[PDB]
């Protein structure tokens with residue numbers, strides 16, 4: 001007779017108190033700049049819904065990044081744009097600088113500030129214990145901000161974090177999966193990269209919230225401190241939950257599904273089984289030990305919970321002892 005509802009613990013009603021225009025993005029009319037202000041220098045990457053390029057703004061000679069959209073429902077384009085406009089100027093959020101359209105193709109393109117990134121496959125190996133703490137704090141600033149502005153990112157993962165290590169500068173990018181949180185709303189669970197999916201997505205619980213992002217942050221942290229990328233390495237969406245169960249154990253999994261009355265896919269019946277909750281030490285070794293501390297593990301344990309209501313908020317995470325060195329240094 002149905003699954004049990006959930007409300008976010010924090011920033012629950014923030015969009016309700018706003019003018020409709022703020023979250024009702026289908027009514028947003030898009031303000032188009034001049035496509036001839038930007039000349040593409042070279043391709044930077046691909047996506048599911050985009051091709052990305054370095055470009056020059058010829059009026060100021062500023063370097064710029066251009067995300068040319070593949071055909072996607074116009075609703076989804078207005079959402080990314082609206083979300084980006086709402087968040088502009090927020091801490092460690094990428095700045096949307098312009099929106100242009102090819103006058104012939106009619107293909108839309110988003111123009112962003114350039115960050116002098118160093119790709120994470122090279123950067124993460126160089127990273128000290130202190131660096132991980134510093135950049136994790138920087139990410140949490142962005143997440144607390146967007147959550148406080150009524151927005152879930154829903155795609156937090158290393159590819160979506162730009163770090164200019166030289167200037168100790170971080171930007172959270174790709175708001176193309178992001179959505180507005182409204183209490184009661186049932187969301188698409190076919191979101192996020194497999195390795196970063198929260199249990200709520202994996203068991204098809206739709207009434208999820210900001211805390212989804214905190215799970216994915218936990219996945220990031222785990223891979224960085226344990227130097228194991230990715231941390232939960234499922235073969236598919238089913239085996240992804242099993243890879244999690246083999247670590248957080250099945251006891252809390254079934255208490256979770258019980259608490260929310262979740263109709264578990266029949267196909268999980270075979271493969272899930274019974275597994276104990278492991279201790280973090282099973283993942284410590286001499287190569288990664290210098291990154292691992294009791295603080296780090298305490299923090300990680302409080303991100304990585306099945307029950308979304310029981311995970312740390314961004315603000316609570318920022319107040320954790322793991323960050324005391326960082327908070328002191330920022331004053």
Ligand SMILES: N#Cc1cnn2c(NC3CC3)cc(Nc3ccnc(-n4cnnc4)c3)nc12
Pocket residue numbers: 044045046047050052065067094112113114115116117118162173174175176
């Ligand atoms: N936004 C943004 C942004 C800023 N600097 N920077 C850089 N800087 C590096 C020196 C080159 C690379 C990059 N790359 C990609 C690749 C693939 N997808 C995206 N993307 C998808 N949706 N939004 C962005 C970005 N994106 C960005």
